[PDB]
Structure formats: C-alpha cells, structure tokens
Amino acid sequence: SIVGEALEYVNIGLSHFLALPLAQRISLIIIIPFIYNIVWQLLYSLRKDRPPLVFYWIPWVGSAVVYGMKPYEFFEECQKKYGDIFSFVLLGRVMTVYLGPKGHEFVFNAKLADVSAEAAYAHLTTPVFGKGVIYDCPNSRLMEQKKFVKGALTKEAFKSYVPLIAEEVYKYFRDSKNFRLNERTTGTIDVMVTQPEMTIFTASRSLLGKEMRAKLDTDFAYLYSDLDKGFTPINFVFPNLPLEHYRKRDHAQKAISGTYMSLIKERRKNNDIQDRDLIDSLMKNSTYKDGVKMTDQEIANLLIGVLMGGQHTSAATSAWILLHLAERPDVQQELYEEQMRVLDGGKKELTYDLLQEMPLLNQTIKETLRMHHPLHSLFRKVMKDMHVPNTSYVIPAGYHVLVSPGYTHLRDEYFPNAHQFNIHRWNNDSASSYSVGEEVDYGFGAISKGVSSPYLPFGGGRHRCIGEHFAYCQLGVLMSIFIRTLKWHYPEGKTVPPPDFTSMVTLPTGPAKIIWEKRNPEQKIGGRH
Numbered sequence: 001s002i003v004g005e006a007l008e009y010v011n012i013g014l015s016h017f018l019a020l021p022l023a024q025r026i027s028l029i030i031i032i033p034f035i036y037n038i039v040w041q042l043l044y045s046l047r048k049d050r051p052p053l054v055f056y057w058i059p060w061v062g063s064a065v066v067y068g069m070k071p072y073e074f075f076e077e078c079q080k081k082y083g084d085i086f087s088f089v090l091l092g093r094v095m096t097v098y099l100g101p102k103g104h105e106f107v108f109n110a111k112l113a114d115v116s117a118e119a120a121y122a123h124l125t126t127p128v129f130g131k132g133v134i135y136d137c138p139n140s141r142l143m144e145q146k147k148f149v150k151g152a153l154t155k156e157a158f159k160s161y162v163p164l165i166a167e168e169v170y171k172y173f174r175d176s177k178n179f180r181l182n183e184r185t186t187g188t189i190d191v192m193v194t195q196p197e198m199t200i201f202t203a204s205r206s207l208l209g210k211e212m213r214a215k216l217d218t219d220f221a222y223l224y225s226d227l228d229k230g231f232t233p234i235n236f237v238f239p240n241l242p243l244e245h246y247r248k249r250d251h252a253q254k255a256i257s258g259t260y261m262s263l264i265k266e267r268r269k270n271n272d273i274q275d276r277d278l279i280d281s282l283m284k285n286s287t288y289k290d291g292v293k294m295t296d297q298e299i300a301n302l303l304i305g306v307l308m309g310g311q312h313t314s315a316a317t318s319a320w321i322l323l324h325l326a327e328r329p330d331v332q333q334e335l336y337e338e339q340m341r342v343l344d345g346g347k348k349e350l351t352y353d354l355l356q357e358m359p360l361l362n363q364t365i366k367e368t369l370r371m372h373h374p375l376h377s378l379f380r381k382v383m384k385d386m387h388v389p390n391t392s393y394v395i396p397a398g399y400h401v402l403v404s405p406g407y408t409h410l411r412d413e414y415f416p417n418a419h420q421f422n423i424h425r426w427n428n429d430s431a432s433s434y435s436v437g438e439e440v441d442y443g444f445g446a447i448s449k450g451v452s453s454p455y456l457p458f459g460g461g462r463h464r465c466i467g468e469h470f471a472y473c474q475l476g477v478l479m480s481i482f483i484r485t486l487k488w489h490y491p492e493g494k495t496v497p498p499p500d501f502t503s504m505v506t507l508p509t510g511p512a513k514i515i516w517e518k519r520n521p522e523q524k525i526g527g528r529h
C-alpha cells in the first residue's frame, strides 16, 4: 500500500510540464486560468451569503464590455434574472449592484466604516484635480471642504451670478461662430460643441471671477481641454502609464492650478479680498475645525474639482434639454409664455428671484435630469463585510457596491411612462429636490436623512451633491435666454440621439445637431467686440 508511487509521478509530472514546447506552455497559461474561473464561478453560485454573480467567460475583464457599452440594459437583464442585488466582475473588481430605493439606502446611507467613496474615486480624480483635496484626503476633510464650497453658493451669491451668467450667454450669442446673432438669423450648431463652451464660460465668470473668465479668451483654454482629457474612464484602470496625454494632463493641472495661486497670492498681498467669486470666498473661509488651513495649492485644486465636476454634469444636461425641446415646439411655446408672463414681456430683467417664479422652466431641468442622469453609476469600496438586511447576503470587504439612481428614474414603476419627456409630471413639484422628512448634517449642512426617494438626481448622504442650486441657477439663466431668443428644431429626419455611455457621463452621441432661428431677426445684442 505505497502512496509514494504517485507522488513520484507528481514530481515527474511537474518536470514534463516545464519541458513542453513553448507553443503549448502559452496555451496552458491561457487554458488553465480560463478553466479555473469557470470552475470557480459554478462553485461561487452555491454560496447563499453572496449575491448572484453574473457569469462571464473572460477572466479579469469580466462583464466590462457590456456593462460599459449599455449599462442600463445590463442592469435590467440582471434584474430580471437575479432580482435587485447581484454582483458582476469588472476589469479586475467585483461590483455588487443594488438596484432601487433600497439600494440607494444600502449604499448612500452606508456607515462611514462600511464603505469608502475616496477609495473608489481617488485614482480617477486626484491626478486630474491635484493633491490633498476631495478624494485625496480623509472623509472628514471632504465634509469640511464641502462646507467651504457651499458657503460661496448662497442665495445672495446666486443673485450676483444671474446677471454675470446672463451677460455671458448674450456675449456667446454675439461672438461665437456657432451663433453671431447680430449677423445671422438662423444656423446649425452641434450642441456637444456649443454647450461645453457655454458651461465653462458661465461657470468661470461666476465661480472663478472675471480674471479667470478672461484667460479663456486665449491659448490658455487648451489647458482645460488637456486637463479635461486626463479625466477619462481609463484613468480608472491605467491611471499613470507614461504616455503624453497623461503629461498634458499633469502639465495642465500644474499650469491651471498655478494660475489660480497667482491670483490668490496677488489678492492677499493687495488685500483685495472681496466677495466677488468662489476665490474670494475660499480665501476668507478655508480653515478646518482642527485649526489647519488649506494651502493655496489645496485651494486651487479644490477649484479645479469644482469647475470640472460642474462642467460635465451641467453641459450634458443643457445639451439634453436642447435636444429634447428640439422636437417639442409645444414645450418651447409653453416655456416662452411663462417667460413673457414672469418678465412682463421682457420689460423686466431676469433676477434669481424671478427665476424661482418659473416653474415650467425648472420642471424642464427637473425632467431632463430624470431621463438623463449624468452619472449612471456611483461607487463605494467596501471596507467591512456588510450584511444586506432582510437577506442572508454578506458583501465581503474588498468588493464594491454600485448604486444607480438614474436607472430607477427610467422605471415605469416609479414614473408612469418613464421613457416619455413630460415636464408636467412635475406640476406643482418643480423643486430641484425635496427633503421629504427628517434631516441630518454631515459637516456641510442639513440634508435629508432618508435617501429613499426614487427621484435621486443628486444622490444623498454624506457624498450628496452641493451643486444643485448652482446648476439650476446656471441652467436656469441659460435656458431662459435660449427660450426668449431662439426657436430650434432638428434637421430633416433627425431626433434625440441615444446616450453615449462610454464617457461614463451619459452624453448624447455626437454629432447632435439642432437648427436655430431668431425670434426677432432684427434684434441686436449690444456691446463692443
């Protein structure tokens, strides 16, 4: 009864392995891991403390291809197969999706020890924005940075911004080659060209100030284009490989951040610290509660983060608003009547107050954000094993949880006819969001305690957006002026493009063109150029 007989042949077997032709070693190095993860998945499927894991053929890659291309379709299939909790493998990671209001509650209100937003995002954002801020710092510092940024975003701030944002829109109509309203009465624009430029011009002028706005009329603008391109989903897998767009990214980050510090330091040494923009505001108020101040570099990187995050959400949203209204002249007609009423047929200048008396305009933003959430997925890295309540599931640490409020936005269950663009579903309900009950404060002010609203455009919980009022102000002024100046429609046989999900921001697949006409061909925008 000898067992060695075989253990010898284990050893012999290993030696015949090392000596196979390289033709076959490569083959074996491919077939053996392939077979291994198919065996592992069938085995994983028997654990009852695990959400179902979407089956996948290629290891490591996982379901990345279909997830990246059509994530909402991927969610609906996996939801029909396995229900509202499931996992799937994604470019090296396991994502545990939790669909629906309960998923919102499980992830957005997760405990600070269970999940980390900075662990999921810092690789994507820190090379773009800079160091020491946002996701390159502990959550407590985040909460106080949001407290600083919010302080420049007050109602009195927004009254200053409305005329500046409006001056910027008119100047863009006057001077941009896509309009030139003093020279042409009709034209064709790509909204994916016009809207990003309008967003940065209005955002720069109002948040950063006139100096920073002015710099975008020079070769400097290309640095924002550079810094923009470093903000790419393959920052999320290959974040610092030594290619050149990784360098123009880091150069633009250094160069842009340098410009803000120059202005900051020049204001402190001229004592020229007013209340004109977010730069004055962060200068006067950026000391943490433990007494540490933000450095001028940390302040500037927080500005890059503000402008950059606002840039992509806002520009995509005004692009969808225009594309949706391009086939709804009835809605343009209704929005134009409200403009005429609230503003005495133009004999009243637009103020932040009159903006709040325009519920149908605000309903259009509301509705566009329901059909086109700019972020289809939000993530956390799981730090501690989490038991999914009223199940037997344990999400072990090292997984990621993925919440997707914009998927629920498109469910007939929660929005009758969810795929119709209908601003009237928000009749007497035009608030950008509503704290439907009890509130909580995480460091940056009282926000809703529950995050179980099926309309959750701005998320909830500690990582909840603080830009919604700024975005409504900016989009509000922009669309008010658009509506009062132009009608617009599609070229023959064109309609609303489908969303290009691969940028992770749900942009219209460009080119997305509209044809605009002047409501008053003979009208002239003033000022010099």
Ligand code: HEM
Residues within 6 Å of the ligand: 117, 142, 146, 306, 307, 309, 310, 311, 313, 314, 317, 369, 373, 374, 375, 378, 379, 457, 458, 459, 460, 462, 463, 464, 465, 466, 467, 468, 470, 471
């Ligand atoms: C249509 C406009 C916008 C939408 C739909 C939107 C959406 C969101 C969402 C869903 C989050 C939560 C992310 C998460 O929990 O994983 C968020 C966070 C945030 N957003 Fe917005 N956003 C918009 C505009 C803006 C603007 C214009 C700004 C700046 C002026 C801004 C600044 C922020 C900040 C600072 C956070 C904090 C993230 C954190 O605390 O980790 N957002 N936004």
Ligand SMILES: C[C@@H]1CO[C@@](Cn2cncn2)(c2ccc(Oc3ccc(Cl)cc3)cc2Cl)O1
Residues within 6 Å of the ligand: 121, 125, 134, 142, 145, 146, 147, 149, 302, 305, 306, 308, 309, 310, 313, 375, 465, 467
């Ligand atoms: C992955 C993350 C989730 O949300 C965003 C996208 N976004 C959301 N609203 C606007 N942009 C995002 C959110 C905020 C942000 O910038 C700041 C600015 C100030 C503070 Cl105090 C904190 C952060 C940058 C991004 Cl890129 O990406």
